[PDB]
Amino acid sequence: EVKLLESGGGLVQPGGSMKLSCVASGFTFSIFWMNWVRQSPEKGLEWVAEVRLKSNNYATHYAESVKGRFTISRDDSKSGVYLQMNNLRAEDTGIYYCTRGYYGSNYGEYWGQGTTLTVSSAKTTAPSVYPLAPVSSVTLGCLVKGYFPEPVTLTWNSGSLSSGVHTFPAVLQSDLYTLSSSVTVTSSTWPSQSITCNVAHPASSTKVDKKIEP
Amino acid sequence: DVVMTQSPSSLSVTIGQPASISCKSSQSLLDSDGGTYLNWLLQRPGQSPKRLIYLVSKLDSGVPDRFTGSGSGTDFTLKISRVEAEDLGIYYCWQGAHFPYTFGGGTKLEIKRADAAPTVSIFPPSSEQLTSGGASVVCFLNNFYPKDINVKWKIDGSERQNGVLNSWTDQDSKDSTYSMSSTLTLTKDEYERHNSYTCEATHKTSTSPIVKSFNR
Ligand SMILES: [Cl-]
Ligand SMILES: [Cl-]
Ligand SMILES: [Cl-]
Ligand SMILES: [Cl-]
Ligand SMILES: [Cl-]
């Protein structure tokens, strides 16, 4: 199976540096060009860099806005392609995908799940979690307030409760994100059973569970 | 950088209906080797973009025959013979005839379904929040259509517009409905000095707005 394991994202202050890694497996690495592709709500999808084979001494091609700042490289031994990023600005914020081969032809469709990069001056803040109890069926809620940066992972009952769940996308307000989630179960299960909102924020090393009580 | 222009920006289609997406490039995508390097890709929110078509009309494995690419030079078209609910997401065109490789702006495909009323629910601040000095009242609006909807807040009669954070989920792939969260944020000093709070949803699914309220 073709796998492109990306890592090395996270929060970095403007003007700072960061190196992204892409460890590839499931195919012969040295015979494929490797690419970095990024995505942001402002600029959409953008090709960042391309690196070619060994015989051409690993020729590199970059997008204009990253020339002189970004450097793509590959280590055929470790089966890895890397993206060294210097002098980062806010516009570099987004999701970075590692892709295999020429995208315009066959065999070149594979992209990795990507890793997120956040370039900001705002500091890391822990989320405030508030279990939401109600005032036919019963609707429960959970409030993840005031955290930075993205992302957080909200699950219900350690991932057991998966149906009837609406996790709402994060909203940025004053350099702080706010996320909420709703759960709808049959009234015969709650408060008969126990329903707990599980929120994890790895940036602030946060793993907090909040039980819902009437 | 070759500019890829997509039209329209948003596409709303009923199940079974045919639909098409246009893509025009600033320069010809016909390369010297006789090949025309244009891709069609689809992205479902939160997930990695998946390629559907390469070389104008060649389909990747797994991609249904309902998707058909065509065109030449600078003009290209993606055609969906009969739209299914799982076809939703953002479609992008992409050129590989010139570096830097460039993407189109994208075309969001919305599944057109029957009108559905929002299942509204209001929530007073928690015990942890009030004792911490803050106060947020949360109003949930689950499983509704169309997406166009607005929530008005009311505190002891009058309304407050500041301190409101709204968030829409992406269109569900199964029931084609939308969900929306509205959080009114203020202080405990502002909260304890009032009793009744109300989130008022104004949808076209009803003449009178759907109302949930509490008194504390
Ligand atoms: Cl595979
Ligand atoms: Cl992967
Ligand atoms: Cl191989
Ligand atoms: Cl270089
Ligand atoms: Cl290299």
Numbering used by the authors:
A (entry chain H): 1 to 52, 52A, 52B, 52C, 53 to 82, 82A, 82B, 82C, ...
B (entry chain L): 1 to 30, 30A, 30B, 30C, 30D, 30E, 31 to 211
Quoted passage from the original study:
GroEL is a molecular chaperone found in many bacteria, whose expression is upregulated during stress conditions, such as elevated temperatures or high concentration of oxygen radicals. In the current study, we generated and characterized 13 IgG2a mAbs specific for FtGroEL. And we map their partially overlapping target epitopes and those of three mAbs with other crossblocking profiles (Ab53, N3 and N30) by hydrogen/deuterium exchange - mass spectrometry (DXMS) and visualization on a homology model of FtGroEL. Further validation of the FtGroEL homology model was obtained by determining the X-ray crystal structures of Ab53 and Ab64 Fabs at 2.5 and 2.6 Å resolution, respectively.
The final Ab53 structure contains H chain residues 1–212 (with the exception of residues 128–133, which could not be modeled due to poor electron density), L chain residues 1–211, 186 water molecules, 2 sulfate ions, 6 chloride ions and one tris molecule. Analysis of the antigen-binding site of Ab53 shows an open-ended groove, 26–30 Å long and 10–20 Å wide, with walls formed by the HCDR1, HCDR2 and LCDR1 loops (H1, H2 and L1), and several pockets in the floor of the groove. One tris, one chloride, and one sulfate molecule are bound in the putative antigen-binding site, where they may be making interactions similar to those of the FtGroEL amino acids in the epitope. The sulfate ion makes a hydrogen bond to Y96 in the H chain (H-Y96). The chloride ion makes a salt bridge with the side chain of H-R52. As the Ab53 DXMS-epitope contains five Asp or Glu residues (E355, D359, D361, E363 and E367), the sulfate and chloride ions may be mimicking carboxyl groups of these amino acids. The tris molecule is located in a pocket formed by H-I31, H-F32, H-W33, H-L52a, H-G95, and H-Y96, and makes hydrogen bonds with the backbone atoms of H-I31 and H-W33. There are two positively-charged amino acids in the Ab53 DXMS-epitope, R362 and K364, and the tris molecule may mimic side-chain interactions of these FtGroEL residues. Additionally, the side chain of R362 of FtGroEL in the docked complex occupies the same space as the positively charged tris molecule observed in the crystal structure, where it makes an interaction with the side-chain of Ab53 H-W33. However, whereas all 12 Ab64 contact residues are outer-surface-exposed in both the non-GroES-bound heptamer and the GroES-bound heptamer, only 4 of 9 Ab53 contact residues are outer-surface-exposed in the GroES-bound heptamer, making it unlikely that Ab53 can bind to the GroES-bound heptamer.
